[PDB]
Amino acid sequence: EIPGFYNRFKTQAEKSTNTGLKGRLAMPIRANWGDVGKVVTIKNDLRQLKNLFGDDMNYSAFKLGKLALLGNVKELLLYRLVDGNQKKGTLTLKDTTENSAKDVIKLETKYPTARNFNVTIKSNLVDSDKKDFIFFENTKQLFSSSIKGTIDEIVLEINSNLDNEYVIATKVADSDTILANVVNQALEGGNDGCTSITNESYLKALEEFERYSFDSFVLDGVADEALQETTKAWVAKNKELGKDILLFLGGKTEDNIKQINDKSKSFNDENIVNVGSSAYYENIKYTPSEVAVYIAALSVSKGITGSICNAKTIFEEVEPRLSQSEVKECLKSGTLVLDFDDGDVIIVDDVNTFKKYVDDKNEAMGYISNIMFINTINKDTSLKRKEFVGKIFNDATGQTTVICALKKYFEELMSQGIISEFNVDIDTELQATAKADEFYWKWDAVKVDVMKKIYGTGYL
Amino acid sequence: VIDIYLKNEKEKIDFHFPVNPQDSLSIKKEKRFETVDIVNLGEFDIKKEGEKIREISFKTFLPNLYSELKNPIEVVAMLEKWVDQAEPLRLIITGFGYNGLVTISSFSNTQTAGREEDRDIEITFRTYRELKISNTKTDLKDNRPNTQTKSKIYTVKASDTLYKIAKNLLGKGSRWPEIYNIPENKKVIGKNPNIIKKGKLVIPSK
Amino acid sequence: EEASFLNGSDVVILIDGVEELYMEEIKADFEQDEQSIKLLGCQNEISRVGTTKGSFSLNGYKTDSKFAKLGFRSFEIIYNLSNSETLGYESIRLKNCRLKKLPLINSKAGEIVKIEVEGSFRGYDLLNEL
Amino acid sequence: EEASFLNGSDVVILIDGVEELYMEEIKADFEQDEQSIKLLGCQNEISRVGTTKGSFSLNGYKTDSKFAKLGFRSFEIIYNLSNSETLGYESIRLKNCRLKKLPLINSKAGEIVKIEVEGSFRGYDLLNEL
Amino acid sequence: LDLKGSFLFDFEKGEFVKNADGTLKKCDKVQAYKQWCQKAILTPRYKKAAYTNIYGSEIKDLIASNLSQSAKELEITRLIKETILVHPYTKEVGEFSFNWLENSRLVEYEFDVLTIDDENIVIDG
Amino acid sequence: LDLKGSFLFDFEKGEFVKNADGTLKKCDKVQAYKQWCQKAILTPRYKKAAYTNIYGSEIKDLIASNLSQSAKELEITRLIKETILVHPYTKEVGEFSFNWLENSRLVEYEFDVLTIDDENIVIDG
């Protein structure tokens, strides 16, 4: 640009508000648009989600992605689940002067999809030697540009301009005369693959997600029992590999309180959470499976310090309204239930499915915040572990170095006010048989909890 | 980094302090309010709508040899002249993050026993404000300070017209007869106000 | 590297133009009340020069009532240090000096009667620079 | 454990870019007027940094009237300490230094004419770090 | 108060947006105010003779100034703030930020607050 | 104010400049003022009985004075400044400079400022 003063204006919603967020979430989204069969990270930006996967609320990508985005997650790891049968919108444009109408240019959508991309080419009224190439999505204009008649420039100009993130031109053959005038020629042949998603296809996303790391995983708004059991085993497997993934689920729409509570009781893993209530958001219903996305995002976003014991959700109304007795049963069953209070939908008590046992010390394990606190410490120690496994001499000075590292790391948690007391020391028992990466250590800490209930007694 | 700039305008001088303000700057702020008592209730605080003039003060020394520099005697004469200036001064303090029109309330120099060339300075500023003494309707507020100065004599340019000179150099633009009615302007200008030439020197009033 | 130092044996002192050869110690310093003030933007303090004050101490062995008779009258002290290994000599004179206290009486046991004089001097002149 | 210390024999001092090799003692410190204030909730008092002040002392054997002729003029002192057992050397320069008092005269008995200089310096630069 | 709407003008294209009818695209009071704010920022003060001294800014003249970086930041804050605040609809402008992305080439942010952005007390006797 | 013009007088030649017509060369108000200033400086005060106490200077009498160099510099500034400022057209005189080019033989500069040199504020309601 030339030297001088330049200025622009933006809506406050366009502010770079991504600063200060926390947490990582995963999703096997169904999407009409964007990359297929791969994980992609989004930095909590609505436009980024819009550009990467469109804005079709009918598709689980934008719908659930918006909810997770509203949950204030630092990073969302989206996977475009697909059925197969994948295709990209495509079209071939032809030359005028050849009486055979030689095909010279092939256009194609940037990503597979089924949306109605259309092309309209008309004679450039200023100069017939050029022509105006206007790219359409349905009746809406999407990009316009005039172009020279030579084929190579036309493919270049289409691929050149900024507004062609949707379509990429390709040359089939050379010719001298401009393309034929046409109006709203659809890029037929495409397919988003959302049709008839198989139960098995979810498993591809799971294995792809494993190489990545994330704080929690939530299904794509689906309450199929097979997927839940499959994901239950999958998350349990990843725990044995050291990857502590927190799973969020929601029962089927037609499940009553009896079905939901039995489902929560049936699997009482502390890494699993059942949503026992649908919810409203601008007149659009969200099934308990769908709501679990927002619940997962809020829990992940709160991180360590915060909790959702009484967080005011974005939702506007919850269809199943429960009495205190019904709430007590659902809460006792490990069901996570949203309650309507004075125009506000509020999550209650931060519970997870682990409520059957609560064997003394395991009482704390029934709450999501406690488990999130535990998992994060394991991840942090695992990170520090891999810097030293078979890479530092297993001597007393080296072991003291490791303890100093761990002890200082916990001392940061003291600085956050998360923990009231902590201790980390040499595990003298397991130290009797040490090896290069088999030095062993022990610790225990006292997490500070969020205030949950108050009892008052008015003496009079 | 800290710097102090005094941008006088009625004298087009952009003074930059050679020396930072010694020990510490400080600016107060005090809400304009009055206290009233009520029988059987006690005291109460009533805010008064108007704002309050607040002061900035510090002290320095004008060194003889140091980055741009000038003699301390001339600098003291410069500031002492500015003390009597009715028009306001623009004070900017980089590190302190202060920027606003002010006027020098008090000024004092001093020659210590040694260091006879230097002059220890103690200066005080006051926040400056302006007094802006049909078909009622909402319009833009008159918040902009009008601190801008021009020469008392104008050299007419090629494209200029007497109305245009009045608006650019005297505000409303309909003020042109004030320029014309001055006999010196009448002498240099032709008897037709509408006709003017590049060069002619013209004297705006005041 | 070479030996070109100086020794107090070479010291020659003229108290008011009179060789007070019996003084076996002398020292005079010319100090300045350097003001130190701290500036807002500069991390390190700024030191500003000030007025100078001359002090001198002079002690020797008593041989007469010269200093007691002298009193607090102003006088001059010319100090000459001469290099003997090589030619050249320093020569200083304290321009205007006065006693701060008369060592009126001092003596102890069988020791020699030492005398100690302390005072101040307004200014000085450097007459030779080696 | 190994011998890698340094000795004052290795000291090299350039007073205003001139090797004043006759100075057999030097020291300079760069102190800070650390404010210490006590907070209501914190048991232990909080220390806040402040402006720095540079002081230096330098004394040696007199060989000329260099310092007396120098007066209170600003000047520079470059200090170089060199490891000889292994290569490498520290190099410091006091950015702007002034004398606090001229050792105008000093001598006693048969002793060598020692000279002692004290002053302050505004700032410094670390030119080499060993 | 009764501020009134105005007509859109795409500063990117430098032309008025007009409907298929051919009439210029009207827009809201708040949209008009945002349109006005960008225009006033881009209008240098004292130079475009149609407007009085109140209208316009002086950001362009600051480029040639010899003031330091920090001083120029404050002047930018003063100039932008003074220019915008003349409008009745403005409540407050602030939260300025600066980023000297290169050695001497700057990017800065600021946040505007409308009269409607005010918070109202809820009470009555 | 309406100050009026006067007639040239070449101080180098000590005579009035006259046109080929023979009439004395008139000149501008500002030229007349400059002519007046040099004359007033060269006119000693209190001695030429035609003029009152206001007119004239006293620079010549300062030569015999026993004041030091710096004192004489201030007196020169006071005397020149006082003599010139009596004229209505003067706004300010200052920026005095001195150069004792020899041991005791002086050259000095000073700058005069007219009423027209003032800077005017540009504003109207």
Numbering used by the authors:
A (entry chain g): 13 to 472
B (entry chain T): 2 to 67, 75 to 141, 150 to 215, 217 to 223
C (entry chain Y), D (entry chain Z): 8 to 137
E (entry chain l), F (entry chain k): 24 to 148
Sentences copied from the publication:
Here, we reveal the extended and contracted atomic structures of an intact contractile-tailed phage (φCD508) that binds to and penetrates the protective S-layer of the Gram-positive human pathogen Clostridioides difficile. The virion can be divided into five distinct regions: the head, neck, tail, baseplate, and needle. Structures of purified φCD508 virions in both extended and contracted conformations were determined by single-particle EM of frozen-hydrated samples; the resolution ranged from 2.6 to 4.0 Å for the extended phage, and 2.9 to 4.2 Å for the contracted form.
The tail is terminated by the baseplate. Importantly, the baseplate of φCD508 must be adapted for binding and penetration of the host cell S-layer. The baseplate is minimal compared with other structurally characterized phages consisting of only six unique proteins. These are organized into a baseplate hub, which connects to the tail, and a wedge, which forms a collar around the needle. The baseplate is also expected to include the host attachment proteins gp67 and gp68, constituting the tail fiber and receptor binding proteins that bind to the C. difficile S-layer. Although these could not be sufficiently resolved in the EM maps for atomic modeling, low-pass–filtered maps show protrusions for the tail fibers. Peptidoglycan hydrolases that facilitate enzymatic penetration of the cell wall are a common feature of phage baseplates, including in the recent structure of a diffocin, a native C. difficile tailocin. It is striking that we find no obvious auxiliary domains with structural homology to peptidoglycan hydrolases in any of the φCD508 baseplate or needle proteins built to near completion within our cryoEM maps.
